[PDB]
């Protein structure tokens, strides 16, 4: 009955491959095989490993409602995030979606409880933008990226929440100036605002030395040369 | 900076776990956009980055791109993913060759010392689709002996079996008493509708291992029907096709 290591090894190898139906089955078996014999965050992730693995399996089979139901009493922010995302995926993120208010509320309660997991901060940041609360969206998205600096989707929503060169200059002065992503952001943002100057080209060159054969950076260079030319 | 690397890896791992596929794809592209008995795991380490990328494309349903990414990769995981990406891309285009190229690639690999189970699985699947049942059983049988908890291979095996004879035969070649051999026999018998005494015996034996397993619970309902709410549900869902 400690054989269930074989279920884990299967779940791992099949998810890697991505044999989703094989995983789903293995997860279902894994859960419901008897009682099994921030620091606090990872500890809850260990407690919910099996329950998460299951929900994610349902999620990868597009069985979203079931994925959310699976993690209904789960306290880890990974589980909470997945639950909330799965919920949204029934019927990117919009006000007309049936689950949207519910998400909002769940995220509000979590903020008053002093949660600041980046992916939930991200979610918060997204929802506030959609509700035309730009200055609050920036607040949450800024926090997110400080904690999760290589999480591109948060930088994009951040750029979308910024509507002036002032508001931009402000935010940029609150991010790690030396950090590679702060630079990659400033090039993206400056372009999307069309307030492209010397420093943007300077920073893009600095990024290209790190990522010489990146399609994204190549597309940015094209976009900068085109803005300057008008 | 080789820390930028590690932060991209931590992102890829956390975002994949969270279902954020587009975030992963980006991170992977960046990651591969910087300068640089069994030995299988050693090749997996070599191709970690190239794999991570292809899998990102694969999770965005960008199958052809995923396959092209791993074209020169030698690990059976990469090979499998490559060939599987092709199959799936092939199967969407249905609405046939392509299975041919896969077939051939799998043949050459089998003469070469290779019999990785997930490739055997792939072989097994492709032969069934080409109406070669007796050959599909051969490969799927090998697979499950090596990879006994890999459900998708047992299901394709059951699908490749069309008589109680062909079933009884195959079952006599699997570790009788191995757990999954029992779970299989219950599924297969039901899916062929020749259910007997022993099926109920074996299901009870499985249920003491997995007392709250949704799948086993569905099987029990399906057997108790066979002996003569869940029936209300979709047969495709209950047989785990879907």
Numbering used by the authors:
A (entry chain A): 21 to 57, 77 to 130, 147 to 285
B (entry chain B): 20 to 55, 77 to 135, 152 to 284, 295 to 308
Task: List passages from the publication reporting this PDB structure.
The wavelength was chosen to maximize the Bijvoet ratio, on the basis of the available energy range at the beamline and the expected diffraction resolution of the sample, following the decision-making model for an S-SAD experiment proposed by Cianci et al.. TRUNCATE and PHENIX confirmed the presence of merohedral twinning with twin law (h, −k, −l) with an estimated twin fraction of 0.37. Clearly, the two halves of the crystal were actually two separate crystalline domains and were successfully treated as such. A variable micrometre-size beam allowed the collection of sulfur data from separate regions of a crystal, which would otherwise be discarded, thus overcoming crystal imperfections owing to the presence of two differently oriented twin domains. The long wavelength enhanced the Bijvoet ratio to 2.21% (1.0% at 7 keV), thus increasing the anomalous signal to a level where it was possible to determine the sulfur substructure accurately even with moderate data multiplicity. The quality of the calculated phases allowed the autotracing of 384 of the final 472 rebuilt residues (81%) at 3.1 Å resolution. The Cα r.m.s. deviations, calculated with LSQKAB for 219 residues, between this structure and that reported by Zhang et al. are 0.80 and 0.92 Å for chain A and chain B, respectively.
Cdc23 is one subunit of the multimeric anaphase-promoting complex (APC/C) which controls sister-chromatid segregation and the exit from mitosis by mediating the ubiquitin-dependent degradation of cell-cycle regulatory proteins. The Cdc23Nterm subunit has 282 residues, with six cysteines and five methionines (one S atom per 25 residues), and is thus comparable in size and sulfur content to the lysosomal protein from mouse solved using S-SAD by Lakomek et al.. The sequence identity of Cdc23Nterm to other proteins is below 30%, making difficult to find models in the PDB for molecular replacement. In this paper, we report the structure solution of Cdc23Nterm achieved at P13 using a S-SAD experiment at λ = 2.69 Å (4.6 keV) and the related methods and we discuss the instrumentation.
